[PDB]
Amino acid sequence: VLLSGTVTAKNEQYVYFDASKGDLDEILVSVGDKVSEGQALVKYSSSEAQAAYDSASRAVARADRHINELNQARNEAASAPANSVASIDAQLGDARDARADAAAQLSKAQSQLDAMTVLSTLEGTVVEVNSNVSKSPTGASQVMVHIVSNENLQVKGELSEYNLANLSVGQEVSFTSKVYPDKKWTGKLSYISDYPTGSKYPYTIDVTGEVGDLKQGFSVNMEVKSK
Amino acid sequence: LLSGTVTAKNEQYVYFDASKGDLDEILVSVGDKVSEGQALVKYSSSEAQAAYDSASRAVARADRHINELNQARNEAASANSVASIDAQLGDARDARADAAAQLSKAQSQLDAMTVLSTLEGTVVEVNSNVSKSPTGASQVMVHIVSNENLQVKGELSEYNLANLSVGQEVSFTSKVYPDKKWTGKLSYISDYPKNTGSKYPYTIDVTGEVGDLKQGFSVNMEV
Amino acid sequence: SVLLSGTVTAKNEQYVYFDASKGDLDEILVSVGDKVSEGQALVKYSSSEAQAAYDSASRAVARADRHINELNQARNEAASANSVASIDAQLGDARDARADAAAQLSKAQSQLDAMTVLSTLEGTVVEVNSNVSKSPTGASQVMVHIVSNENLQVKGELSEYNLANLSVGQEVSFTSKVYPDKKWTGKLSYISDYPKNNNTGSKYPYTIDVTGEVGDLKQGFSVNMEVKSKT
Amino acid sequence: VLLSGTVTAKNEQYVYFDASKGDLDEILVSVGDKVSEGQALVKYSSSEAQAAYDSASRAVARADRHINELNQARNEAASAPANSVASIDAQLGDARDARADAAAQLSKAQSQLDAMTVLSTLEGTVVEVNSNVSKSPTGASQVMVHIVSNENLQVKGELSEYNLANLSVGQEVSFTSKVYPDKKWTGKLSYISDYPTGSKYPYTIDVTGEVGDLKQGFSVNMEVKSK
Amino acid sequence: LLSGTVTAKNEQYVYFDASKGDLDEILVSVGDKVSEGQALVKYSSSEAQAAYDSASRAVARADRHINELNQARNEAASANSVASIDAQLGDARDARADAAAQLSKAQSQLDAMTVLSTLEGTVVEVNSNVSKSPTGASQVMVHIVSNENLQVKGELSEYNLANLSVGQEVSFTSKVYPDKKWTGKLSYISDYPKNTGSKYPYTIDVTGEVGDLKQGFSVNMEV
Amino acid sequence: SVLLSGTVTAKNEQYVYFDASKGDLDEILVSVGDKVSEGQALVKYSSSEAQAAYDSASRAVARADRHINELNQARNEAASANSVASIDAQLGDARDARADAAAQLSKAQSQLDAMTVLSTLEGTVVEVNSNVSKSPTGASQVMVHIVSNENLQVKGELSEYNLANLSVGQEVSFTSKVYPDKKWTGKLSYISDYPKNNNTGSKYPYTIDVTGEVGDLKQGFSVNMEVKSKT
């Protein structure tokens, strides 16, 4: 049995415009760069986030002071020659709670700041930048950065109803490429689906050995046995 | 003579939900077998955990206030008045009730950060690249199908609908394996067409010995 | 006489679409191919928050009543020499509080029964779908579709010519190319004055109600009809 | 010159589902009814509106009381044997203002109640009801009731680039109908456009005399002169 | 040899805006002539008028407070202290400034309930039936065109673009009136195609004697 | 050598779409067919509310400074016997207020200059449109489109075959069927590893930068090219 797939990349990352994050400052990457696993890619305007952060830490510090004046007032009104120590122990409770509130909010604003710059999840090739996107429910999704890893290649395809009854997972195969009639690369079948002129099910093969000169999107061809 | 396709019966589509914050991690690839009540996708449990902790501090605050109140009754009952201290003990009891309620709501909102499977089956599609902004279309992140309790669904025409059946135990073949028969019991004939004629979908619960039969096979069986 | 084409359609139907403003879905409690009668529930959203709202509201009426009572016991104690004018004012401000508590309560009541959508007709459920998104992701998400297989009708359109030949009330016979020995009757019940929207002419929708015994006549059937003239 | 239009109605009213108004109770009209100029058509759920209204009038009444206790307290503290009369004259100002606030809001909630039932703007024929609409940005506009008046008919059409240079507004014409070859109706041209195989401009004719048996949508035909 | 169409130069599309409340009345039919700064559509001026009145009461309240303040200075300056009364007179001045600001904002939001024309011209399209809910599409309620300062717009191909012109005074005809010529001065040739070839739009400001020439006419003029 | 087709495209461009979150539009202050340089304004929204925000913010810093000062004069008066601890606390709470006032002020500053959108490049404006709606009525409303007619390029796609014959850097000649006596040169600058998305094959986008004198060569021109092999 002769099959034909196309070689795809395994790992991608898309980056869409997030309206809820405000306004884009600059995309700091160019279509062609190989980016680190943790390299930055997009920076939103981070002034409102930094301001909310500062306000949060001032709220925390003010909570700590406030409990400190309450503390002195307590240990004065107590060892007092005898307003109430309990009347402000209440306030102490309702001030430690406000302190914990401001603490949690500070951490929230902290990551609300970290969210303003988008990092990669992978080292690959940026293949698309688009700095001209709008903040409006535009009816579609506005891609801003597309990164795909050119390593751990696979080859994906489909097979007919008849064609599934021709062996399965864990099989090693070898394929050929119409642009390099000489060489043949090998692969170990990684996945066959049982979920879809004939119904078609998708297969994926993790590729063995050296990639050599195979580019993504290359049309390939194989030969395996059936039943 | 009619044709139909064998389909699974139970699925689960998880769609990215923006209201639950943002995605942290999808916990299954493709081809995995999942079971009833199993972790599938986990949103960031952060501003949810903070709300839980705040609600907890709220119930503990209500408890502190009621202690500060009934001790202040124990003082002013053997010494403003017990009337307007017992009363505010009532309103304090109310406040503690509210605190426990919104605490439970915080718990539900919390463990909702992680969606669980509703079936035992195989994962078919995972799509971790999804836009938090509205796309204008559904965005599936995970799909589960069970390859058990199969069925055959199809359509009948205005004429062959004049064959009826509440459950004729029929049986079918398909040119993938032509020397085999599979039996099934009819289960549904629609009286309402969809949308040259009006077509009416039919279903049949396949019955036993479903060996190499899987869910893409075109299928024919006449009568 | 006058001949018309038309299709067998139902008269009464109901779609229930997903509603995010009602919260989250628990169960849909109906399976496709189920008879339902007017009033039966067909979807239940999770009634948790609505429950808590009902409880907190009842406690609002409770605390409000307690307040009116304590202010009452505290007005008489002042009528035997704050002052009874201060208490009168606070009373006027606690009756308002109790009215707000009542309104809040009934809001919780109607939001509570709004977590179970009910059927508007005797009918048969033709589609159920428990796979929806929350984010007004796309268009309308039909969750349950039901339609009465009784009181069947047939509809179509009419030429500008047919409008001058036809009046509402005229009797009608019709047949179906699948049951050629079987025949039906019916009556012209609605003729539209208003047009929808190589040969020309605008088309006006008509609907007739089938009369007499309906046999194994099922919706969607193509139908050929003769409208009887009048003496 | 021979023209061909179609007879249209002049006056319509559409009624779309309004999500911001809450939930539909019932459409109280049936496709075929002739409705009054002020007849009702759709009723939304009006319990939240009535509740907000009641709350508004209680807010007004509480404002009036409040200024009355402030009033007694003033005229006591004044002719007082000599807290401050000015200190609560301030409160009186800041209570008459709250009173005016609650008044305006009460009127607002009043029309927020009147908005819960939709009335006609015309007596005509309801031609469409649709009680099965959803509260979601459905991508389209969900018509709920469509009313068109079958009187003050017009006939509308278009004409080619050549065809405009054939006289204009204020002209009387007469037309014929392929379903009644006998009769001919007359009309007085009401509008020609200068704003668009040829560009087409639209004309409308108000119809003279008796409508007789002309239905809307009837294809008509005429004869007028050019230049 | 090229063809073009005569178009108007200045228009105005009014779209229904939900944020401005709801429509009260459109004040023009079709065929009417409107002029610069003329009432066109009027939204309901109700919750806007209420906000204006409230802002006015706010400025009068700030004035009352400053009088209550400096009179309280006139008492305690020849009798807490002038310090913390002069200071709060400063903050009161601030408050009056804010009140006047939000008052002016209330005025702008008020007269925005009524949109005015930006041209002198004829009204082309009025559409009073519009859904307050989002349609998923623009909803024009009124359209104004001026039938003065006409133009001719069209497109050139990749080849005939090799005729250039910053402003060749050309002239054209059209088979509506074949025995007449209309002169025009070129005004724009795009260097950027739109979207068999790449087409480049051109414009020409028509010049004088535009008698029976109106805005739908296909037009031809070669060179 | 290797021959390729391609179209004359520009390198740098800018769309400015309507933004409701910026308020209302006043003027667009550019007409189609205008040269613009990097930094020039191209739309001005009505800066009224932003102005009022700036003013109220400056008054916030004013009143805050007044407060810190009055508390300062009032701490010394207490340091010569409320108490100076109370004043110390209020001071710590007025420095916070002044910091909030500063942050609010700069928020008003950046929102103020955000009411004038500026150009990102030397370019020519190719479309202006002052007829928009506010209600995210539909899709994206392009209000002004500008694009540099300098630094022109040509782009297209490549077969799977072409990928093995071509490297970035190779010199290129090309011509246009409208100026048949005139010829151009250029260099291969970008070859995509990643494919877009009766005969078959996936296609990979390429872009080359034109070099030397650009004549009356205008964007969109169809172009035929020869890529020089290497010794």
Residue numbers in the entry:
A (entry chain A), D (entry chain A): 60 to 141, 164 to 277, 292 to 322
B (entry chain C), E (entry chain C): 61 to 139, 164 to 279, 292 to 319
C (entry chain B), F (entry chain B): 59 to 139, 164 to 279, 290 to 323
Can I see the authors' text?
As initial efforts to get the full-length structure of Spr0693 failed after exhaustive trials, we made a series of truncations and finally a truncated version (Ser59–Lys324) without the membrane-proximal (MP) domain, enabled us to solve the structure at 3.0 Å. The quaternary structure of Spr0693 displays a typical hexameric nanotube, similar to the previously reported MFP structures. The two outermost α-helices form a twisted left-handed α-helical hairpin domain; and six helical hairpins further pack into a cylindrical assembly to form an α-helical barrel of 31 Å in diameter and 56 Å in height. The 24-Å high lipoyl domain at the middle harbors two layers of three-stranded β-sheets packing against each other, with a topology similar to the biotinyl/lipoyl carrier proteins and domain family. The β-barrel domain at the bottom is composed of six twisted anti-parallel β-strands and a short α-helix, which form a stacked β-barrel of 24 Å in height. The six lipoyl domains, as well as the six β-barrel domains, are aligned in a head-to-tail manner to form a double-layered ring-like structure in the quaternary structure. A top view of the Spr0693 cylinder structure reveals a narrow pore, which is formed by the loops (residues Asn211–Val224) from the lipoyl domains. These loops adopt a so-called turn-back conformation and point towards the center, forming a hexameric ring with the residue Gly220 at the innermost site. However, the glycine residue Gly220, as well as the loop, has a relatively higher B-factor, and the primary sequence of the loop is variable in the homologs of Spr0693, suggesting that the ring is structurally flexible and might have a rather broad spectrum of substrate selectivity. Structural superposition reveals that the hexameric Spr0693 shares an overall architecture quite similar to that of MacA, with an RMSD of 2.85 Å over 1226 Cα atoms.
